[PDB]
Subunit: 268 residues, 4 copies
């Protein structure tokens, strides 16, 4: 119960990592406003957390819907301590050469409007509340904000753009609001794409991609966020970027891990 | 003359850094095609260089215009060895708080369509020619692709996004096309902002910004691009990022430069 | 209490951040072994925590001393879940020009033997126990592992070297041992330098250094280490680097923080 | 002939990349002082470049020998414009678990004294000349200064430490001396180790390690250095870090390159 008394707003919190975050935050004693597109999934969530969650239907690309979510959060819980802009869409790892010429303009808008603009609108809408509470923003990034081959040019560009948001917003909102990034990766989750458009099997994932040698469940990706939301724990942190992807950036050339056989080599 | 027989295509090449790059490449023995919105400044550079530079009036946001620049370059010179997507737009360093709610959506599009989508379209247009010549792309980034306070959230996010393009496109176009980034910074360029949107002079704050202790002329920033365009010099480089901003990322806390008193301390 | 039943070993844990970490881990339910040069400050912490902390007097530069700490921890508690190599030495922010020629060799050894080699020996000593418990290492880095002006060349080079250890050891010890780094910064610790070697107060320059706009108490920096020590929270993290320095890397050019006037501009 | 009139000092310039640099610099019109251990190899080099090279026998770990080299350079050519600290030793990729306990202390000193201290001594010795000429330092780094699996903990830590030297020295020597890093990798070269101590075949190197799909010759690694030594080209660059390793940091998860089959896919 690290978050007793705290209030969070989470975008894209009806399913996936968003939902795992909502469930984790509630279990920690926090109260959670959720912005997402599915009314039915939001109401199911509300009743699962009776009193600790409020669900607001809306589009993350719309500043007005972002504002509605912030107002609704304010009305139910009285404050906003932590904002987690989290809602994102994928590009299917569609390479530049495979992006249809008649499709690139639409695809760009679809992915950038959700992934980057929706993050910008979330901060904008929650800004007065966050300054008031001296709160924090924790952006969901991705491995694709750091290394290639986690998406195509569009997705990879969006997640690199949110690293820019972490940096610029950590500067701009200082000294009142802290701004940090968690960059999750290698999760067991189905990533959706845009209407305009439309990748590694388990064997290659754990031998070549993930040094930790396993694909963690969604709940295991929630602790980094809880850390940034815990005022007693994360106060010195602003503009921080936590890579949270099983070790993708420290993977080896021939194998992901170098010490599979340490238990036998050290004869522990 | 390091680039004799080479062909470059530069977007945003009729003024600012782009123009200095046109001048430099022509002087290095290269033939140059230029995509720019300014017919006047394009005519001007066409008379300066003669048959060594062709200008195409167009909009960097448009794929058909980028393709038209690529075809016009092919028709004039036979090939494309180097692409320099360079054309950019600023956001008047406008903070999120100061971004008007009624303008923020259109402002997002204006700056992201030129700074990011225009880069993507440039590469898309030129891909067949670049793969044919086994050439290279060199993206103009900025200090705002790496550190805060070089623009507002919109611009900083866009330039962080082109860092994403350097990395993803270096992966995607390898082994045939090398993709690198130059990140220029201490320039006295007066870069325009969007019409959907209504900062201290660099000289006034130099000692808090630039370790090099001086404001380089525009021509001083062209050498990095020549390096990346020269096959015999930059062959091992792909996915490289050259911070080329006077040392903004290595500035001290009290003052930018740490060795002002070195000539006295060493008795020069 | 997040660390009930866990055992940590902390080098340099009798004063400064190290001591705050001992206090925090004991309060989280963990049992703690401490390697420190100060028998006095070790006795002091032994009476404060009772059977929850054992102190071993020794030299972090010495492998046999590090091994002795590991064996003493094993004998007292049965296992090692977390290693925090933390013990460090400063260089009085002495510039290269100001490093005496007759002292520079010994100064190199003093600072590199504790800051780098002492980290290597800590991990070497504890490897069998860490692999057995499938635990983790958390290296104390510093803002000087990432940006200039946080020490002279010697210290900055050492802290950049521990960044190398985070990455290489995360690769080498995966999948069994996670290796991460915390990089603390805005502390009021008075860290000692070498005897082979004879800076503005942080408070005087705060507005040029810290976006957060305040000097955190030592206890405020302990939460990141608890996060990394907690298996249920930091499981996907290996090779991660947490900048935890008040936002030194995202400071503005004129002043550290960009939003001093946010409460007035939003009318809080 | 980019370097006509310029004077360079290069450590470890008798063989390997050092020698390729010496040969390149002389071909560009520069004059070169070389510090290395082999008298016979230095004299052979001197006569190959009659008048454009001076060879000084000495140990890079010794400030006195570094001073001798600087004095000798001053005496033959009258100035020093560019310093390239380049001399380095490898660790054989010896993992922490494979470093013998009776060998680690010696091995640490051997690799750190050459790789880090020898770089520090080179700058120290050449400092008055470089301030006088307003010159530049270009440190040879490595992929091992950025990613794991290019060496063991020792080598990787040393090359990460030189990134720290780039940053701190770029700050400290500003505004008079520029300081940058080239980080070469994937070269066809035999890397020597220390007396205390004592890795990828071609097939795995070009499929998994090098996006560029080829191992470049040594001469192809010389252009980045020529760039930093060319005053007309690199003036805005201080604290820059050029990754120069075939694209190791932008390599893909399953294959190094993503676009091997672009010529056929685009049907160029």
């Amino acid at each position: 119960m690290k978050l007793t008394g705290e209030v969070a707003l989470i975008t894209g919190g009806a399913s996936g990592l968003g939902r795992a975050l909502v469930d984790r935050f509630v279990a920690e004693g926090a109260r959670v406003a959720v912005l997402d597109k599915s009314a039915e999934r939001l109401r199911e969530l509300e009743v699962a957390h009776g009193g600790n969650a409020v669900g607001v239907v809306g589009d993350v690309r719309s500043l007005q819907d972002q504002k509605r979510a912030a107002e609704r959060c304010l009305a139910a819980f009285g404050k906003i301590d932590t904002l987690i802009p989290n809602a994102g869409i994928w590009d299917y790892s569609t390479a530049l050469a495979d992006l249809p010429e008649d499709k690139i303009d639409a695809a760009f808008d679809d992915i950038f409007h959700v992934n980057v603009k929706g993050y910008i609108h979330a901060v904008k809408a929650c800004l007065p509340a966050l300054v008031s509470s001296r709160g924090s923003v924790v952006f969901t990034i991705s491995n694709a904000g750091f290394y290639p081959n986690g998406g195509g040019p569009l997705y990879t560009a969006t997640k690199h753009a949110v690293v820019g948001l972490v940096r610029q917003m950590a500067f701009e909102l200082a000294p009142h609001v802290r701004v940090n990034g968690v960059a999750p990766g290698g999760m067991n989750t189905d990533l959706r794409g845009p209407s305009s458009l439309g990748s590694v099997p388990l064997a290659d994932m754990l031998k070549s991609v993930l040094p930790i040698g396993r694909m963690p469940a969604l709940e295991e990706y929630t602790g980094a966020y809880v850390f940034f939301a815990t005022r007693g724990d994360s106060l010195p942190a602003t503009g921080a970027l936590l890579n949270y992807d099983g070790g993708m950036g420290v993977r080896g050339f021939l194998t992901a891990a170098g010490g599979a056989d340490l238990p036998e080599k050290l004869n522990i």
